[PDB]
Amino acid sequence: CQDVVQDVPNVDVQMLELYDRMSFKDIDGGVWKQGWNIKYDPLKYNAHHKLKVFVVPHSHNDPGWIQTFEEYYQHDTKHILSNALRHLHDNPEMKFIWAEISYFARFYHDLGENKKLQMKSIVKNGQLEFVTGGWVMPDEANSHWRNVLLQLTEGQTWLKQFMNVTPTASWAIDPFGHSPTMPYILQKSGFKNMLIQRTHYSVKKELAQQRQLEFLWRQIWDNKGDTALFTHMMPFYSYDIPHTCGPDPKVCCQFDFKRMGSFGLSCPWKVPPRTISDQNVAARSDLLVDQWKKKAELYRTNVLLIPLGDDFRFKQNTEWDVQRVNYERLFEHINSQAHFNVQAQFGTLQEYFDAVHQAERAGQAEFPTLSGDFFTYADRSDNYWSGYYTSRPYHKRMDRVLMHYVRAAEMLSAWHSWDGMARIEERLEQARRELSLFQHHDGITGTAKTHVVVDYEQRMQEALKACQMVMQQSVYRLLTKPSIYSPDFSFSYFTLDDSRWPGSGVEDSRTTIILGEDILPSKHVVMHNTLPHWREQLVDFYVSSPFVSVTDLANNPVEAQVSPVWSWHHDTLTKTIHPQGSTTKYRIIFKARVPPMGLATYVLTISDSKPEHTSYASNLLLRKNPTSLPLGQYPEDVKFGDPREISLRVGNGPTLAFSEQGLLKSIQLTQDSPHVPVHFKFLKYGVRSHGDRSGAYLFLPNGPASPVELGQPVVLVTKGKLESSVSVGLPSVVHQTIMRGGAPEIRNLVDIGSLDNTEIVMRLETHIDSGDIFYTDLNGLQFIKRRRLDKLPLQANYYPIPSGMFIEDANTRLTLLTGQPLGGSSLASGELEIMQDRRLASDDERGLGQGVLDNKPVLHIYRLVLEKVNNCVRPSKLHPAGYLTSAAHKASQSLLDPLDKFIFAENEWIGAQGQFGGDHPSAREDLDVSVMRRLTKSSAKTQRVGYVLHRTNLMQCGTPEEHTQKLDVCHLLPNVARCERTTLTFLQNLEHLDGMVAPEVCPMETAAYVSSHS
Ligand SMILES: [O-]S([O-])([O-])O[C@H](CO)[C@H](O)C[Se@+]1C[C@@H](O)[C@H](O)[C@H]1CO
Ligand SMILES: *[C@H]1O[C@H](CO)[C@@H](O)[C@H](O)[C@H]1NC(C)=O
Ligand SMILES: [Zn+2]
């Protein structure tokens, strides 16, 4: 195994280093506005060294953006595909690449058999070529790597089954900035090449000058280079035709033949395209070939890529004709005019890369190596696209919830083979596709029109319901005596209980367990743990009486705590934000202990009075002018007081101090240790009154944030033996700090209401001497070192915070883990900040055509980990990566993959068992079974189950290792007859494994295995 901490990779271009050196000056470079006037030596190309040009027709089809997926399909895409089939069939030399499989699959299943056959033939013969082959072209900033893999697998599995092809070249022309998580996943999925486009204009300029636009992109910690994937970065401002033929858009626009008038398009540079003819072909060719040769100067081989397309292009037959005919005339003239020394033709993306590597192999060029990422993107001036790291935060949080439900549903149902009548495969396929669709770069990014966001939400809601149905049927079969199990596949044996989604104050959706001497004395509940190690976590349920005790199925008492159900209200009468306690329902909390990838059953029983093993939390409402807060049967009276500083300690955990406004002020790790200053504060960013306005994409603040005026907020303190918390009703946010014995959990119920042109940020202030350094993660896969650069504007120092961020000095580290992707930064030494929501009245001119005024309450969740790191073995100062500690990693897992909770729906569960998976191996803490998916239907004689195993890298800080058993996923199911290592998509077998044993992977590595069973 490579050491990912101590050896600094030696690469030609290291993005953090390049950023530190670059000046980012935005000067007018001439017709190539962000570059310079390219000059070339006409003698470079000649009879023995020609410029091979590949013109690649393409059509960018967004699976939802300003129209929903289905509206685009009906109005545009089905026509584009229908006409592509006809035109390619009839013009053998014409080519076309396709990226979005969600649309292709939608089209293909609507085709008659005759057309399906014609389609397969033009794919088989190379005319229509799939690039990437994912369900969508995902966002690369907010997306979790697990969902990036999920959508890639969904599209590629469909392609393998129906088109018999697996793309090895990726095409990503629209994500707003790019992540190294893509080549990581792609290189482990059989890919050989990839192309990206939206990178900062200054980076394009810099790499172009060095001819470093094509590079072997390896991971930041990869010393050897085995993760390397050849990458081509386009050089210009857009993927449209005016910005793809060469440096001068006024000339290139003249070669987009759909802009002559009848199509309602024109050239903004004021020179229109002109139909190519025998009398103008020489002059048109001279202009075009000159653009081509200039573009060629920015690359190292004599093979040139010329994309030819734009949004939803190649729709009308007349469009296909006008583009094809004119280009055929240009090619015939250019290729027969020896003096140009050019051979041009229509080509596919793979054809381009194949020719590039043939040149490389002929010793024509050597490519530089590169590590790093391409955030935060700016397409021009100071227009940095960091706004979308936060836009539509409700759905960004929903993404993570569904992510986990999909994994749990596929894992829980994987244990058995199911009869087709159970509709398990059907429900899982729908859930995977709706979550996959939302990975689109106008989906999770929050950059779509209001009605389209609603469509994605409705789709995800159905996906959540599908996961629940599958999960609950699976639990029932897994925990019921086999000879008693009698399933009704449409029946709800269990109801899922989720305490954080939609969340208290967002939707009153949780069911109350109703017990009573005259109706039902007890209720079974079951917890599922998708992680491959034994796990304990507190779980809570609503019950109709405070006198409830908990036992496991061996009838052993389980210590429990009951607290009130508190809801916050904006009292329009008193003009205050305060809590009201339920008088009919209460929260019971207890520690669940669950096997690796298993289930554990508990029983809640009502009693006449206080049960022996249940304690009750005290509650204290701090505010001036208090009024009574009755709680029905709750046995402890609420206390009142004037606002004041307070301190709390649960178990042996840290002791936290809060200001009289209910916000954290300090953390004390142990009884002896000091009270380390850690202050939470909420602020607001505004919008500029002159110049460019912030929108769904752009963050253009009118300067540093201003503190939110807090007034004298109401603060609620609940103190319990198992869980305590401090909650405060601030303007736009009910902020909560929850303590359970370890790092606190933070929850923000964010309702930006009608606060127009406002962005709410949550900031942490400490004395940590971090200077200008901070760390943020990429797709929940790795942490990359960031350096705040004052030579760039504030918005440029904002980065995606998909799951975590931290700052540290030689001795102390503060890590903030998130349950949703949001944007954030460290704008001053000792600080961390992350945006909660943003409401913008204006459009930011990137095509959306609207601002963001559809905000809705959202419950953001976090874990805040303060730790001493002076004893930790960390990477050297020049290493571009950072790594989490064991506690921070566990804390992230508690947010993204919590225990799932199920309430038995009927009165009695006959045949109930207390546990499943007690014999599953409890793997080392840095290892996870990211995916467990049965790959065969029940009629398959040989059953196959796929596993994706990921090993992160945790810092060694002096804590002895201990125990843990080897996890061999190939032996998790009985009767194994074969074990194979495969690509991450499970589509290609890479290794037949001896003894049918799946070995574990190395730190930061990810592998897939498929076990076959008789
Ligand atoms: O013309 S336009 O206003 O629709 O926008 C252009 C071309 O200028 C874009 O490239 C459309 Se790109 C389509 C969509 O997925 C992105 O959100 C858009 C971000 O800008
Ligand atoms: C297509 O995949 C392979 C690769 O060319 C080919 O040999 C085979 O005939 C096709 N697969 C099937 C099952 O039709
Ligand atoms: Zn797009």
- Our mutation pick for probing the ligand 1 site, out of 67, 240, 384, 846, counting the most ligand atoms within 8 A of Cβ, is 846
Q: Tokens 């072997």 sit at which residue?
A: 216
Residues with CB under 6 A from ligand 1: 62, 65, 174, 238, 240, 311, 441-442, 447, 846-847
CATH code, domain with 684: 2.70.98.30
Residue 519, class by beta-carbon neighbours within 10 Å (0-12 exposed, 13-18 middle, 19+ buried)? exposed
Residue 508, class by beta-carbon neighbours within 10 Å (0-12 exposed, 13-18 middle, 19+ buried)? exposed
104 CA distance to ligand 2 middle (Å): 20
**Which one-letter DSSP state was computed for residue 73?**
I
Within 10 Å of residue 415's Cβ, how many Cβ atoms? 18
Same domain, 190 and 318: yes
CA distance 866 to 813: 6
Which atom of ligand 1 sits closest to the CA of residue 447? 17
> Which residue owns the Cα nearest ligand 1 atom 1?
847
Phi and psi (nearest 5°) for 476? -55, -45
**What Cα–Cα distance (Å) separates residue 131 from each residue in 29, 170, 467?**
33, 5, 30
Contact in structure between 979 and 757 (CB atoms under 8 Å): no
**Angle between helix 78-90 and 113-124 (nearest 10):** 60
- Our mutation pick for probing the ligand 1 site, out of 58, 77, 174, 452, counting the most ligand atoms within 8 A of Cβ, is 174
Contact in structure between 397 and 438 (CB atoms under 8 Å): no
Same domain, 818 and 908: no
CA distance 544 to 606: 9
- CB neighbours of 348 closer than 8 A, spacing ≥ 6? 54, 56, 95, 96, 97, 126, 129
> Which residue owns the Cα nearest ligand 1 atom 19?
846
Region of 705 please: left (phi>0), alpha (psi -120 to 50) or beta: beta
Across the beta sheet with 745-750, the strand order is 639-641, 618-622, 715-719, 724-730, 733-739, 745-750, 858-868, 812-818, 804-808, 773-778, 782-787, 881-882
Which amino acid is located at 870 in the chain? N
Contact in structure between 662 and 683 (CB atoms under 8 Å): no
CA distance 949 to 932: 9
Of 895, 890, 686, 930, nearest to 802 by C-alpha is: 895
Same domain, 861 and 929: no
Q: Which ligand lies nearest the alpha carbon of 310?
A: 1
> Which residue owns the Cα nearest ligand 1 atom 2?
847
What does this entry list as its resolution, in Å?
A: 2.0
Which amino acid is located at 178 in the chain? H
DSSP secondary structure string, 614-632?
EEE-EEEEE-SS------T
CA distance 671 to 850: 54
Phi and psi (nearest 5°) for 937? -85, 170
CA distance 387 to 699: 4
Contact in structure between 598 and 579 (CB atoms under 8 Å): no
CA–centroid distance for 893 within its chain: 15
Which of residues 464, 492, 520 is at a domain's end?
492
Q: Which ligand lies nearest the alpha carbon of 161?
A: 2
Contact in structure between 142 and 799 (CB atoms under 8 Å): no
Q: Which domain holds residue 349?
A: 1-381
CA distance 293 to 938: 58
The two beta strands, 822-825 and 128-130, are: unpaired
Binding site listing for Zn(2+):
60, 62, 174, 441
Q: Which ligand lies nearest the alpha carbon of 388?
A: 1
**What Cα–Cα distance (Å) separates residue 348 from each residue in 131, 307, 324, 586?**
9, 9, 15, 63
- CB neighbours of 578 closer than 8 A, spacing ≥ 6? 568, 569, 571, 621, 623, 714, 729
Same domain, 59 and 189: yes
CA–centroid distance for 161 within its chain: 27
**Which one-letter DSSP state was computed for residue 664?**
E
Helices (H), 573-672: none
CA distance 409 to 413: 6
Same domain, 473 and 528: no
Contact in structure between 634 and 618 (CB atoms under 8 Å): no
Of 314, 240, 64, 175, nearest to 848 by C-alpha is: 64
Which of residues 356, 381, 406 is at a domain's end?
381
CA–centroid distance for 601 within its chain: 32
In the beta sheet, which residues pair with residue 304? 53
Which amino acid is located at 678 in the chain? V
**What Cα–Cα distance (Å) separates residue 1008 from each residue in 121, 933, 955, 968, 970?**
32, 11, 25, 12, 11
Q: How many C-alpha atoms does 548 have within 13 Å on its Cβ side?
A: 33
Dihedral angle computed from the Cα positions of residues 873, 877, 882 and 883, in that order, rounded to the nearest 10 degrees: 0
**What Cα–Cα distance (Å) separates residue 47 from each residue in 43, 338, 339, 508?**
10, 7, 8, 75
> Which residue owns the Cα nearest ligand 1 atom 3?
847
Contact in structure between 521 and 547 (CB atoms under 8 Å): no
Contact in structure between 386 and 796 (CB atoms under 8 Å): yes
Same domain, 607 and 672: no
CA distance 648 to 744: 11
Give buried/exposed letters for 350-383 (b at 16+ CB in 10 A, else e).
bbbbbbbbeebeeeebebbbbbbbbbbbbbeebb
The radius of gyration of the chain from alpha carbons, rounded to an integer in Å, stands at: 30
CATH code, domain with 523: 2.60.40.1180
- Taking the chain, what is the end-to-end CA distance rounded to the nearest angstrom? 34
Of 387, 453, 393, nearest to 67 by C-alpha is: 453
The two beta strands, 494-497 and 900-904, are: antiparallel
CA distance 345 to 355: 13
CA distance 192 to 492: 47
CA distance 817 to 841: 30
Within 10 Å of residue 767's Cβ, how many Cβ atoms? 11
Of 26, 382, 387, 17, nearest to 204 by C-alpha is: 26
For the annotated catalytic residues, the residue numbers are 174
Q: How many C-alpha atoms does 784 have within 13 Å on its Cβ side?
A: 28
Of 604, 859, 591, 892, nearest to 723 by C-alpha is: 591
172 CA distance to ligand 1 middle (Å): 14
CA distance 991 to 473: 35
Sign of CA pseudo-dihedral 584, 587, 588, 592:
positive
128 CA distance to ligand 3 middle (Å): 20
**What Cα–Cα distance (Å) separates residue 178 from each residue in 99, 141, 211, 352, 792?**
17, 7, 19, 21, 19
Same domain, 843 and 945: no
846 CA distance to ligand 1 middle (Å): 6
CA distance 50 to 364: 13
- CB neighbours of 892 closer than 8 A, spacing ≥ 6? 780, 803, 804, 817, 863, 884
E strand or H helix at 184: helix 181-187
Contact in structure between 316 and 20 (CB atoms under 8 Å): no
In the beta sheet, which residues pair with residue 728? 715, 735
Which amino acid is located at 121 in the chain? S
CA distance 832 to 815: 9
Of 234, 140, 213, nearest to 182 by C-alpha is: 140
Same domain, 539 and 679: no
196 CA distance to ligand 1 middle (Å): 16
Dihedral angle computed from the Cα positions of residues 557, 598, 529 and 184, in that order, rounded to the nearest 10 degrees: 160
Q: Tokens 């014995």 sit at which residue?
A: 741
Contact in structure between 914 and 553 (CB atoms under 8 Å): yes
Q: Tokens 């460290």 sit at which residue?
A: 826
**What Cα–Cα distance (Å) separates residue 427 from each residue in 421, 592, 649, 784, 958?**
12, 29, 45, 37, 46
E strand or H helix at 867: strand 858-868
Of 181, 182, 177, nearest to 132 by C-alpha is: 182
515 CA distance to ligand 1 middle (Å): 56
Give buried/exposed letters for 865-878 (b at 16+ CB in 10 A, else e).
bbbebeebebbeee
Same domain, 346 and 388: no
E strand segments, 704-780: 706-707, 715-719, 724-730, 733-739, 745-750, 758-766, 773-778
Structure tokens at 616: 């009750």
- CB neighbours of 885 closer than 8 A, spacing ≥ 6? 813, 815, 865, 867, 869, 872, 954, 955, 957
Helices (H) and strands (E) in the chain, counts: 16, 51
Contact in structure between 810 and 772 (CB atoms under 8 Å): no
In the beta sheet, which residues pair with residue 603? 524, 551
Number of domains in the chain: 5
Of 58, 311, 314, 356, nearest to 193 by C-alpha is: 356
Q: Residue 707, preceding bond cis, omega within 30 degrees?
A: no
CATH code, domain with 63: 3.20.110.10
Which atom of ligand 1 sits closest to the CA of residue 845? 3
CATH code, domain with 967: 2.60.40.1360
Structure tokens at 29: 């470079």
Q: How many C-alpha atoms does 480 have within 13 Å on its Cβ side?
A: 18
CA distance 433 to 502: 21
> Which residue owns the Cα nearest ligand 1 atom 5?
847
Which of residues 492, 515, 542 is at a domain's end?
492
Same domain, 266 and 121: yes
Contact in structure between 656 and 739 (CB atoms under 8 Å): yes
Same domain, 626 and 574: no
Q: Tokens 């930006």 sit at which residue?
A: 752
Contact in structure between 257 and 250 (CB atoms under 8 Å): no
Q: How many C-alpha atoms does 422 have within 13 Å on its Cβ side?
A: 20
Within 10 Å of residue 17's Cβ, how many Cβ atoms? 15
Same domain, 440 and 416: yes
**Which one-letter DSSP state was computed for residue 75?**
I
CA distance 14 to 373: 9
CA distance 545 to 867: 40
Q: Which ligand lies nearest the alpha carbon of 696?
A: 1
> Which residue owns the Cα nearest ligand 1 atom 20?
846
Which atom of ligand 1 sits closest to the CA of residue 846? 20
